[PDB]
Amino acid sequence: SVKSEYAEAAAVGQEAVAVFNTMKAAFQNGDKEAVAQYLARLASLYTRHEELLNRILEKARREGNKEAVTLMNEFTATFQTGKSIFNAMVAAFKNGDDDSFESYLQALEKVTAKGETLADQIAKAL
Numbered sequence: 001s002v003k004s005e006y007a008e009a010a011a012v013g014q015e016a017v018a019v020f021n022t023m024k025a026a027f028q029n030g031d032k033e034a035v036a037q038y039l040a041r042l043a044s045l046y047t048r049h050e051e052l053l054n055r056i057l058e059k060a061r062r063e064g065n066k067e068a069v070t071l072m073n074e075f076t077a078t079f080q081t082g083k084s085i086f087n088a089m090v091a092a093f094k095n096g097d098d099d100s101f102e103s104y105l106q107a108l109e110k111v112t113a114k115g116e117t118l119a120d121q122i123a124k125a126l
């Protein structure tokens with residue numbers, strides 16, 4: 001049901017947290033080859049997460065579940081801010097701009113955590 005799809009979406013979000021933290025560690029340590037691979041992995045993970053979030057939102061709409069639709073619209077908007085910041089982080093790595101990369105790393109953590117306080121109202125509304 002929409003809830004098994006939400007559990008999968010939550011798990012993909014958790015996989016992205018895991019890979020993100022390993023990537024941050026590699027960035028701090030100067031292992032640029034590892035960072036490149038983790039950034040490619042995160043891009044794939046964000047694409048999969050977005051696909052699951054869109055299926056959840058579209059299903060809540062087809063059910064006319066007004067509260068779930070509202071929360072999912074808000075959450076997906078914040079998720080997109082995170083993705084825009086992630087894309088800018090990718091570009092800073094490409095350009096050799098470690099100062100900007102550090103700053104985006106920090107920004108992406110805070111925006112991702114902000115989206116998460118909606119996650120538990122979403123699970124109860126679905």
Ligand SMILES: O=c1[nH]c2cc(Cl)ccc2o1
Pocket residue numbers: 012015041044045048
């Ligand atoms: O659940 C998952 N984990 C995944 C990791 C990559 Cl790289 C792509 C899709 C995924 O879906």
